[PDB]
Amino acid sequence: RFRIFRAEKTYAVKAGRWYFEFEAVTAGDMRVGWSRPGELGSDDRAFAFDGFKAQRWHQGNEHYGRSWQAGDVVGCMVDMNEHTMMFTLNGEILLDDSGSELAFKDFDVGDGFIPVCSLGVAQVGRMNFGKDVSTLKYFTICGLQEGYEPFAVNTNRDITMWL
Numbered sequence: 001r002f003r004i005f006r007a008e009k010t011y012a013v014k015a016g017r018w019y020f021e022f023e024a025v026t027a028g029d030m031r032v033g034w035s036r037p038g039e040l041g042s043d044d045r046a047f048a049f050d051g052f053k054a055q056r057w058h059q060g061n062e063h064y065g066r067s068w069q070a071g072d073v074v075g076c077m078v079d080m081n082e083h084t085m086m087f088t089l090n091g092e093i094l095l096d097d098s099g100s101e102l103a104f105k106d107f108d109v110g111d112g113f114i115p116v117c118s119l120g121v122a123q124v125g126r127m128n129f130g131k132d133v134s135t136l137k138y139f140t141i142c143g144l145q146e147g148y149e150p151f152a153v154n155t156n157r158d159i160t161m162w163l
Contacts, residue, residue: 003119005127009037011155012112017079019148020115021128021136024068028052029120032127034078034085034113046116047104049074049087049094056096056103064103065094073137076115077148083107091141115151129155 022032031040033048041048041057048057049065051074056064065087068074075088085104087094093101119125130136130150136143139150 002121004040004116005119006035006116007114007129007151007155009114011151012037012114013078013080013151013154014109014112015080017077017081017146017148018151018154019136019139019143020076020130020151021138022074022076022117023126023128023137024051024072024074025070025124025126026122027068027070027072028123030118030123030125031057032074032117032125033057033076033087033115035116037111037114040116040118047085047107047113048116048118049076049103051089052120058104058107062096064096065089075138075143077143077146078113079148080109080112083109088138088142091138093142131156 029052031048031050035046040046044059051068054065054067055061077086084102087103129152131152
């Protein structure tokens with residue numbers, strides 16, 4: 001079986017610019033990206049980078065970026081206002097075959113998104129939401145100046161209020 005990891009769904013983002021990292025400890029079959037709350041990216045429920053085969057997945061697959069080596073770190077960026085997603089591999093922005101840095105675009109906000117990843121057999125990968133921002137490895141190279149916030153910024157609050 002595959003192991004699927006996701007942020008707590010209450011923390012889904014519907015606006016703003018958000019960043020997290022995924023360390024590929026092994027270099028095989030894993031995927032990482034953004035999931036709606038409710039084969040990652042084979043359907044409409046997630047938008048994912050496949051660093052094993054160098055593909056972007058949403059409702060199907062296309063070549064995008066390049067494959068990881070063990071120890072590489074993927075940066076995952078979503079702009080919920082412009083409706084775009086980008087990925088970096090060791091800080092370098094990945095492109096599709098048309099030369100675009102927009103991994104995905106023009107999606108509907110719906111109920112928002114949470115970070116997600118999938119780990120296949122014998123795979124090891126770790127999401128870092130940046131609660132300790134200094135543990136992010138490539139955020140200062142690409143993410144910080146561009147105005148993306150570490151996803152942990154959205155998960156520090158644990159109280160809600162009504163009336």
